[PDB]
Design a binder for this molecule. Structure first.
Ligand SMILES: *[C@@H]1O[C@H](CO)[C@@H](O[C@@H]2O[C@H](CO)[C@@H](O)[C@H](O)[C@H]2NC(C)=O)[C@H](O)[C@H]1NC(C)=O
Ligand SMILES: *[C@@H]1O[C@H](CO)[C@@H](O[C@@H]2O[C@H](CO)[C@@H](O)[C@H](O)[C@H]2NC(C)=O)[C@H](O)[C@H]1NC(C)=O
Ligand SMILES: *[C@@H]1O[C@H](CO)[C@@H](O[C@@H]2O[C@H](CO)[C@@H](O)[C@H](O)[C@H]2NC(C)=O)[C@H](O)[C@H]1NC(C)=O
Ligand SMILES: *[C@@H]1O[C@H](CO)[C@@H](O[C@@H]2O[C@H](CO)[C@@H](O)[C@H](O)[C@H]2NC(C)=O)[C@H](O)[C@H]1NC(C)=O
Ligand SMILES: *[C@@H]1O[C@H](CO)[C@@H](O[C@@H]2O[C@H](CO)[C@@H](O)[C@H](O)[C@H]2NC(C)=O)[C@H](O)[C@H]1NC(C)=O
Ligand SMILES: *[C@@H]1O[C@H](CO)[C@@H](O[C@@H]2O[C@H](CO)[C@@H](O)[C@H](O)[C@H]2NC(C)=O)[C@H](O)[C@H]1NC(C)=O
Ligand SMILES: CC(=O)N[C@@H]1[C@@H](O)[C@H](O)[C@@H](CO)O[C@H]1O
Ligand SMILES: *[C@@H]1O[C@H](CO)[C@@H](O)[C@H](O)[C@H]1NC(C)=O
Ligand SMILES: *[C@@H]1O[C@H](CO)[C@@H](O)[C@H](O)[C@H]1NC(C)=O
Ligand SMILES: *[C@@H]1O[C@H](CO)[C@@H](O)[C@H](O)[C@H]1NC(C)=O
Ligand SMILES: *[C@@H]1O[C@H](CO)[C@@H](O)[C@H](O)[C@H]1NC(C)=O
Ligand SMILES: *[C@@H]1O[C@H](CO)[C@@H](O)[C@H](O)[C@H]1NC(C)=O
Ligand SMILES: *[C@@H]1O[C@H](CO)[C@@H](O)[C@H](O)[C@H]1NC(C)=O
Ligand SMILES: *[C@@H]1O[C@H](CO)[C@@H](O)[C@H](O)[C@H]1NC(C)=O
Ligand SMILES: *[C@@H]1O[C@H](CO)[C@@H](O)[C@H](O)[C@H]1NC(C)=O
Ligand SMILES: *[C@@H]1O[C@H](CO)[C@@H](O)[C@H](O)[C@H]1NC(C)=O
Lengths: 144, 262, 115, 307, 48, 49
């Protein structure tokens, strides 16, 4: 049964790939906001400070600051919201580490499917993989 | 789901070219709300879809006395709900806003619940770890007393008393119902965010007007671009407030769905 | 109002086929402008609805899914599972005579990137 | 005759090198699977740019003529290429109605006010466009009804002329001893660049559904699922303006053309009701009128109403 | 540096890219200039 | 933890302190609660066949 794990994984790590990919998409989305006008004459400071007098260029700089500040403040708020979720997942992984690997649990469907015998941890890039070994009955007969 | 262009601009087409100048804010709103929409169907599958096969009870429906008719489906109904489920469901479009239907109908959920009931009453907890193993129900109850440290003869010598007392004790549950404020609060919180989101369109935010067509009707473009840009910023802030709260509130219902699944 | 709604495309993946069906979300099939199917989630055009029941593949909504099986593209109502009838009686028991050791995995994220 | 293009009229939108980056661009292209006219000749319209392909090992096509009238009294383009090299020239010409030893060039008989000079089987593609007074030419010469394939076209020249174009014709070498015309429309594509910097593929983002899914996802491979790609919006027909009745002109005459105005301390107030004012009667009389509107202009409110 | 209109700051180094014979400068993903060609010597230089 | 550590004896590993759970006593804190966990820890092992 352990020899089959390698096939099941090689043919699976979606929970780890999605969290890495989602964060990268948010960081790239932040950079793409540096090419918007946000209601200004341009997006480039070398054009706002070259075709406007100081009393006229201040107005255009404030438009860029407001737009870019709003985008950066949105970026950081969304990370606080996702950070609570990874922390909650880590608390579940820490609970299973004690209760599935350092003990035998009776909790139903907490340490795999079947009757829990034992578990072995394996490290992953941004997480942990548990190998759960369970007892499953087979081949029943009826009696009176 | 909110149509960003129809919420902010609204019909007007001169607005669409102006809204494109703010970047990908409308893409962010769609991605954020889709994440919520996909998780809400998974929440339900994890709580209810914990059974492989759909179990049925035998026709006789007489389990050593115990009378479960108040929790099993009523065959004389189009919906096939139980008598208690019928009480439980009896207590609880706009300018670019739409409500999507759930993936699972409530008939399908009722079928998951009846399968869990039929599995348990006939095989106890064995079907959750492998094959369903039948055992008489009276013997199931005796094992359950043993699990709490009571010797099993207490049931076998008093089977009629426990079954009759149970039947009245479950019967009292309907009286306490005919409670669900936690379910009504979920409905209220979303209804209030949708009623507020629409009402925030009647605000001038310090502009000459609140209607993107009236601005043009009584003003030149050079000045109308400024007035419409103010309204766009205000209503775009409304969408950011809305989506941020849905993400924070969806984490709370997700934590509740995890507790219910557990 | 003059009917509006989202338009979604159902695709088996370009590595299987380039056939597609289109769902007009909460649009009546008489106000859209072959295979036209009305669902509680909108008007579905370009997929055939069958009376069989399969496991859900591409979820549309309200119990209806789509699949690439019959090829072509079809719609249908999901199957929750098989149907088991336990031979219950008031003096019968089932007891296992053998067992198997099974091994499963579970993957959990623990950390994210520090930015 | 007409033929079916496949994926033709794709050109490098600009300079700027680039690597593996499914870049999204909006510009004037020839739509994929379009209806391209075939000719074996008459003045054709321009309207916005031109696609022009042809096939032939010899050189029967001997230049183009562009402009608004293709006649004198206004400026026009003339592009010819003898066996030496391309010679663009921009003057006011007088063109033969049928323009065409080994002696040639009986095309024009006048070359006044020249503002630009220049001197210097087989598939020869050209794209002609005229934007902000610039007359650009894209081309490519690749040796072998059009065939089937993809090949991006590179810019050759860029001419700051300023000239307007509304029509054009062609020039052919007669016998004394086949070409295509497409038109360009504003479309959106998703262009794939290789590491050498060339365009190897494209997706027309306004063709079929599938293509809209690829463009929204920014990929050429879509995984199985369901994707929201766009929206459905019914459109209104006809414009129905209702009213009960009444009619008359607002007596502004008796206000502005009064013989005597009030004193400002005792300013006079005429109330207006139930009439149709053409506020455009005002504004006129330019020598000493001054107009100063607050809250709206005088053009926009002529299509407005007040109690 | 300023390369006939392209204004920026950074370190100039020999590149290993190959432009097309009409292209002056290159951009990276997210559309920021990362390489230019010297008008006089016609060599591609990276901008870090 | 109040129900499973103070009002009963838990078998959950590490949930109610380190060691074999025997009992817990609550204490109040200004904006929280402090649990005193009493555990059984074996000591002084010997080798046997
Ligand atoms: C299970 O309980 C139900 C009541 O909750 C019983 O049904 C009622 O039986 C009484 C007589 O005892 C009738 O007056 C009612 O009209 C019945 N109610 C309905 C809805 O039919 C039912 O008989 C019990 N089952 C068993 C096997 O005792
Ligand atoms: C236990 O015995 C029962 C019969 O008492 C078996 O159930 C029957 O199985 C046959 C097929 O072999 C079906 O056609 C009948 O419909 C079943 N009866 C009922 C009431 O469901 C059952 O197969 C036996 N179980 C085992 C594990 O051998
Ligand atoms: C319990 O089941 C196992 C199979 O899960 C039986 O072991 C198999 O026996 C057959 C017949 O001798 C062999 O061909 C297989 O190689 C065995 N499998 C393994 C994994 O060793 C076992 O005999 C059964 N026990 C009883 C008492 O019937
Ligand atoms: C607008 O004008 C029409 C045409 O004069 C009015 O129509 C008249 O309505 C009265 C009441 O119903 C009838 O007795 C007349 O015969 C109608 N006249 C005609 C020519 O059909 C209408 O009433 C006017 N509307 C208002 C609000 O005054
Ligand atoms: C621009 O002018 C310079 C000279 O000022 C040219 O430099 C020459 O480059 C060639 C190689 O391409 C050398 O063999 C010569 O010796 C260089 N001349 C000098 C004086 O150094 C340069 O090539 C010119 N650029 C272009 C594009 O023509
Ligand atoms: C049980 O016996 C083993 C040897 O079989 C003891 O192992 C010793 O471990 C220490 C380190 O803790 C080593 O430095 C010694 O070399 C080991 N001894 C031998 C003979 O290999 C072990 O300490 C014994 N356990 C107890 C509790 O006394
Ligand atoms: C707006 C307008 O037409 N005003 C008229 C003008 O045309 C005419 O020349 C003048 C002399 O009668 O009277 C006034
Ligand atoms: C995807 O395409 C590859 C070949 O490029 C093929 O091996 C694989 O089976 C395809 N996947 C599916 C699901 O068809
Ligand atoms: C669509 O309209 C027809 C009447 O034209 C009506 O019979 C039908 O029920 C409508 N469909 C939906 C889904 O409302
Ligand atoms: C499905 O079955 C119904 C009857 O239950 C029938 O009316 C309908 O025509 C069937 N559909 C198809 C596609 O055969
Ligand atoms: C192109 O359009 C013309 C009408 O303008 C039509 O006669 C012709 O059949 C069309 N060609 C194709 C290939 O559809
Ligand atoms: C080629 O054509 C141009 C047209 O202006 C002419 O000036 C030039 O002399 C021609 N060359 C030859 C060799 O005739
Ligand atoms: C163009 O030529 C005409 C004579 O044909 C002349 O009258 C006019 O001044 C010229 N225009 C310019 C701009 O030189
Ligand atoms: C081209 O024609 C338009 C009218 O169609 C005119 O407004 C414009 O000024 C002309 N351009 C030039 C460069 O003469
Ligand atoms: C052009 O691209 C091909 C394919 O990536 C590559 O093998 C080749 O080296 C490239 N040519 C040059 C001159 O870089
Ligand atoms: C009254 O105004 C009209 C329109 O401006 C003008 O034609 C007329 O001369 C005016 N009358 C007098 C007496 O100035």
């Amino acid at each position: 049964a352990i020899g089959k794990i390698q096939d099941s994984l090689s043919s699976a790590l979606g929970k780890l790939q999605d969290v890495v990919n989602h964060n990268a998409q948010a960081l790239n989305t932040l950079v793409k906001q540096l090419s918007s006008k946000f209601g200004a004459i341009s997006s480039v400071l070398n054009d706002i400070f070259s075709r406007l007098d100081p009393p006229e260029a201040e107005v255009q700089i404030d438009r860029l600051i407001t737009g870019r500040l709003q985008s950066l403040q949105t970026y950081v708020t969304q990370q606080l919201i996702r950070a609570a979720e990874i922390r909650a997942s880590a608390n579940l992984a820490a609970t299973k580490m004690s209760e599935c690997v350092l003990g035998q649990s009776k909790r139903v469907d907490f340490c795999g499917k079947g009757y829990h015998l034992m578990s072995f941890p394996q490290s992953a890039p941004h997480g942990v993989v548990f190998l759960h070994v369970t007892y499953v009955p087979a081949q029943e007969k009826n009696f009176t | 789901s909110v149509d960003c262009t129809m919420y902010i601009c609204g019909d007007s087409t001169e607005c669409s070219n102006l809204l494109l100048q703010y970047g990908s804010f409308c893409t962010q709103l769609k991605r954020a709300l889709t994440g919520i929409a996909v998780e809400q169907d998974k929440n339900t599958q994890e709580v209810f879809a914990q059974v492989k096969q759909i179990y049925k009870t035998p026709p006789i429906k007489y389990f050593g006395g115990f009378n479960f008719s108040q929790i099993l489906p009523d065959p004389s109904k189009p919906s096939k709900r139980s008598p208690i489920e019928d009480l439980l469901f009896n207590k609880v479009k706009f300018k670019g806003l739409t409500v999507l239907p759930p993936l699972l109908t409530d008939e399908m959920i009722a079928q998951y619940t009846s399968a869990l009931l039929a599995g348990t009453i006939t095989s106890g907890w064995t079907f959750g770890a492998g094959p369903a193993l039948q055992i008489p129900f009276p013997m199931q109850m005796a094992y359950r007393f043993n699990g709490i440290g009571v010797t099993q003869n207490v049931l076998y010598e008093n089977q009629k008393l426990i079954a009759n007392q149970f039947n009245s004790a479950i019967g009292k549950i309907q009286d306490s119902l005919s409670a669900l404020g936690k379910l009504q609060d979920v409905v209220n919180h979303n209804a209030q965010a949708l009623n507020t989101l629409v009402k925030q369109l009647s605000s001038k935010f310090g502009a000459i007007s609140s209607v993107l067509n009236d601005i043009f009707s009584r003003l030149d473009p050079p000045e109308a671009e400024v007035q419409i840009d103010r309204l766009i910023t205000g209503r775009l802030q409304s969408l950011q407030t809305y989506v941020t709260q849905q993400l924070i509130r969806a984490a709370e219902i997700r934590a509740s769905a995890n507790l219910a699944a557990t | 109002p003059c009917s509006f709604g989202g338009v979604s495309v159902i695709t088996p993946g370009t590595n299987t086929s380039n056939q597609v069906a289109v769902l007009y979300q909460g649009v009546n099939c008489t106000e859209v402008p072959s295979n036209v199917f009305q669902t509680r989630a909108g008007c579905l055009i370009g997929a055939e609805y069958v009376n069989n029941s399969y496991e859900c593949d591409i979820p549309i909504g309200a119990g209806i899914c789509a699949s690439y099986q019959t090829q072509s593209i079809i719609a249908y109502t999901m199957s929750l599972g098989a149907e088991n009838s336990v031979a219950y009686s008031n003096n019968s028991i089932a007891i296992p005579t053998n067992f198997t050791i099974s091994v499963t995995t579970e993957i959990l994220p623990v950390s994210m990137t520090k930015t | 005759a007409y033929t079916n293009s496949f994926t033709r009229g794709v050109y490098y939108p600009d300079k700027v090198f680039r690597s593996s980056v499914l870049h999204s661009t909006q510009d004037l292209f020839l739509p994929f699977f379009s209806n391209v006219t075939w000719f074996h000749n008459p003045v054709l319209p321009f309207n916005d740019g031109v696609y022009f392909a042809s096939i032939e090992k010899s050189n029967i096509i001997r230049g183009w003529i562009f402009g608004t009238t293709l006649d004198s009294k206004t400026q026009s383009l003339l592009i010819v290429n003898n066996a030496t090299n391309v010679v663009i020239k921009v003057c006011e010409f007088q063109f033969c109605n049928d323009p065409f030893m080994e002696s040639e060039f009986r095309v024009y008989s006048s070359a006044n006010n020249c503002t630009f000079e220049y001197v210097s089987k087989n598939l020869r593609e050209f794209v002609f466009k005229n934007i902000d007074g610039y007359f650009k030419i894209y081309s490519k010469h690749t040796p072998i009804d059009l065939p089937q394939g993809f090949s991006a076209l590179e810019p050759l020249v860029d001419l700051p002329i300023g000239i307007n174009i509304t029509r054009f014709q062609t020039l052919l070498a007669l016998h004394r001893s086949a070409y295509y015309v497409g038109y360009l429309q504003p479309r959106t594509f998703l262009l794939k660049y290789n590491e050498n910097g060339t365009i190897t593929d494209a997706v027309d983002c306004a063709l079929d559904p599938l293509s809209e899914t690829k463009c929204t996802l920014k990929s050429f491979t879509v995984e199985k699922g369901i994707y929201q790609t766009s929206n459905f919006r019914v459109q209104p027909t006809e414009s129905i303006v209702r009213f009960p009745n009444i009619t008359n002109l607002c007596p502004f005459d008796e206000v502005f053309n009064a013989t005597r105005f009030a004193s400002v301390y005792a300013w006079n107030r005429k109330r207006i009701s139930n009439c149709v004012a053409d506020y455009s009667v005002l504004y006129n009389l330019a020598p000493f009128f001054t107009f100063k509107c607050y809250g709206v202009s005088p053009t926009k409110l002529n299509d407005l109403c007040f109690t | 540096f300023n390369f006939n209109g392209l204004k920026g700051t950074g370190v100039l180094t020999e590149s290993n890219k190959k432009f097309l014979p009409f292209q002056q400068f290159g951009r990276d993903i997210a559309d920021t200039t990362d390489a230019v060609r010297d008008p006089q010597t016609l060599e591609i230089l990276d901008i870090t």
